[PDB]
């Protein structure tokens, strides 16, 4: 079961980045470049550094959507100018956002940036705000945040994990 509430979403955050950056910062910085990774578009390709900055963008969009919230203004899901059937073309944003970040390490630090700002934001908030009501439709603030943090960390570990298949060489 996902997190039900919000200590359960603080701790399935940190156990997934937790395991996710420890696999992130055993790849050394050149393969961490290599477009080894399949895309789900059928002949796409990316990089670990492409699936970072993926990970961030998603993330800086969670705290944009709760930073547009907090000022009155209305949030646009997922993402200004895009459709939620326009994902692939979200993602390949988040790719241009962050492909002048050359250095690995320099990479790895905004992530973490990133996830300690997520947990920031969530501990502003209570139980019942979280996981008691609806936010946008039926699915809860919590659930939101979860569908694009822990979620896709847990994924991004696995995609390591099977890319490892040629790591060990």
């Given at each position: 079961?996902?997190?039900?509430?919000?200590?359960?979403?603080?701790?399935?955050?940190?156990?997934?980045?937790?395991?996710?950056?420890?696999?992130?910062?055993?790849?050394?910085?050149?393969?961490?470049?290599?477009?080894?990774?399949?895309?789900?578009?059928?002949?796409?390709?990316?990089?670990?550094?492409?699936?970072?900055?993926?990970?961030?963008?998603?993330?800086?969009?969670?705290?944009?959507?709760?930073?547009?919230?907090?000022?009155?203004?209305?949030?646009?899901?997922?993402?200004?100018?895009?459709?939620?059937?326009?994902?692939?073309?979200?993602?390949?944003?988040?790719?241009?956002?962050?492909?002048?970040?050359?250095?690995?390490?320099?990479?790895?630090?905004?992530?973490?940036?990133?996830?300690?700002?997520?947990?920031?934001?969530?501990?502003?908030?209570?139980?019942?705000?979280?996981?008691?009501?609806?936010?946008?439709?039926?699915?809860?603030?919590?659930?939101?945040?979860?569908?694009?943090?822990?979620?896709?960390?847990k994924n991004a570990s696995g995609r390591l994990n099977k890319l490892q298949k040629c790591l060990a060489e």
């Amino acid at each position: 079961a996902v997190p039900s509430s919000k200590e359960e979403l603080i701790k399935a955050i940190n156990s997934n980045f937790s395991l996710l950056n420890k696999k992130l910062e055993s790849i050394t910085p050149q393969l961490a470049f290599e477009p080894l990774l399949e895309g789900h578009a059928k002949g796409t390709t990316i990089s670990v550094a492409n699936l970072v900055s993926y990970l961030i963008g998603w993330g800086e969009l969670v705290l944009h959507w709760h930073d547009q919230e907090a000022k009155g203004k209305t949030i646009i899901f997922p993402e200004e100018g895009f459709k939620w059937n326009e994902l692939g073309r979200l993602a390949q944003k988040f790719y241009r956002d962050y492909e002048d970040i050359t250095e690995y390490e320099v990479l790895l630090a905004r992530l973490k940036e990133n996830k300690q700002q997520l947990v920031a934001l969530i501990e502003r908030f209570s139980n019942d705000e979280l996981y008691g009501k609806p936010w946008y439709n039926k699915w809860t603030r919590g659930r939101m945040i979860q569908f694009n943090t822990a979620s896709p960390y847990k994924n991004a570990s696995g995609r390591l994990n099977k890319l490892q298949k040629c790591l060990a060489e």
